[PDB]
Curated annotation (Swiss-Prot), chain A:
It comes from Drosophila melanogaster (Fruit fly). The lineage of its organism: Eukaryota, Metazoa, Ecdysozoa, Arthropoda, Hexapoda. Transmembrane segments: none annotated. This is Insulin-like peptide 5 A chain. The chain holds residues 86 to 108 of 108 of the full protein. It comes from the Eukaryota. Disulfide bonds join 7-12.
From Swiss-Prot, chain B:
It comes from Drosophila melanogaster. The chain holds residues 24 to 46 of 108 of the full protein. This is Insulin-like peptide 5 B chain. Coiled coil: none annotated. The gene is Ilp5.
Length: 23, 23
């Protein structure tokens, strides 16, 4: 996942986590 | 000002952070 790369393999801001949500 | 989460914790976070999921 993009989100795993961003928030697990690295730390991320809350807004970054939110950007990985579906809309 | 960061978060870091892997595995089920990351899935749980996306589940509450995303109003209509992350399919």
């Amino acid at each position: 996942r993009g989100v795993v790369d961003s928030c697990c393999r690295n730390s991320c801001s809350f807004s970054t986590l939110r950007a990985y949500c579906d809309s | 000002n960061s978060l870091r989460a892997c595995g089920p914790a990351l899935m749980d976070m996306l589940r509450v952070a995303c109003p209509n999921g992350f399919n």
